[PDB]
Design a protein around this ligand. Structure first.
Ligand SMILES: Nc1ncnc2c1ncn2[C@@H]1O[C@H](COP(=O)(O)OP(=O)(O)O)[C@@H](O)[C@H]1O
Ligand SMILES: [Mg+2]
Length: 240
């Protein structure tokens, strides 16, 4: 149960592009089991992971005694592979069903082609679901657009909530960048913050990247960040 201290509902700025996703997520965490399952989808750096673990953290705090499980489709892959090699299929099934009340799986696009794993995940889903265990799945693609995927699994993804994250607008981006700073206990000029939150618009992974890059500079160069200086430092965040 090692979740990220930052990935919480409170450090999530809401905006037209992520509002619905954020509420579904929050709602699911307030009533684990009521809406099974929750499948969040969106492109890179849009809050999937962050949102996914918030459900985790929120539940760890308001439902102290409740087995919460976060995981990457990839680990679900790597763990199975071993289950087969090491020979203990049980240990695996005990770990991902018998001993979980809430199961959060991130980046499911990793299972494309991996029909092997796809099959085992399928049942894990059904057993957890038939016993009211909350399931949440994050994907960089929507159920349909998920290539090389077992229809039965895919149709399992839809029988619940389906929310889509979309990149935020400039106004909302600046707010995210500001809340990003708090979390890093940093600080920047009200003209640098702007320039960054206005030109590092690919995704939020890079937005934070830049905001940290600068902080690292303000660490070494004890002086400070000058708008011009920032632009030199952030070359690879405007045209990668
Ligand atoms: N709505 C948001 N409000 C504030 N910060 C956000 C928001 N969404 C994402 N972030 C920031 O971006 C990072 C998470 O990006 P992430 O969710 O992992 O991208 P992805 O969903 O593509 O994996 C976090 O560290 C967080 O600080
Ligand atoms: Mg992710």
């Amino acid at each position: 149960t090692p979740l990220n201290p930052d990935y919480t509902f409170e450090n999530f700025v809401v905006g037209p592009g992520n509002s619905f996703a954020y509420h579904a997520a929050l709602e699911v965490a307030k009533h684990p089991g009521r809406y099974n399952p929750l499948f969040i989808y969106g492109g890179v750096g849009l809050g999937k992971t962050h949102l996914l673990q918030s459900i985790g953290n929120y539940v760890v705090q308001n439902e102290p005694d409740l087995r919460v499980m976060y995981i990457t489709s990839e680990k679900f892959l790597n763990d199975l592979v071993d289950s087969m090699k090491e020979g203990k299929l049980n240990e695996f099934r005990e770990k991902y069903r018998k001993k979980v009340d809430i199961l959060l799986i991130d980046d499911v696009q990793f299972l494309i082609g991996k029909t092997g794993v796809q099959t085992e995940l399928f049942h894990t889903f059904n057993e957890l679901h038939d016993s009211g265990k909350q399931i949440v799945i994050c994907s960089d693609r929507e159920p349909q657009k998920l290539s090389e995927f077992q229809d039965r699994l895919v149709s399992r993804f839809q029988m619940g909530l389906v929310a889509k994250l979309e990149p935020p607008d400039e106004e909302t981006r600046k707010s995210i960048a500001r809340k990003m700073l708090e979390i890093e206990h940093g600080e920047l000029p009200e003209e640098v913050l702007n320039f960054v939150a206005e030109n590092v618009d690919d995704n939020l992974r890079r937005l934070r990247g830049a905001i940290i890059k600068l902080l690292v500079y303000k660490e070494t160069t004890g002086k400070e960040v000058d708008l011009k200086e920032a632009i030199l430092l952030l070359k690879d965040f405007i045209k990668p």
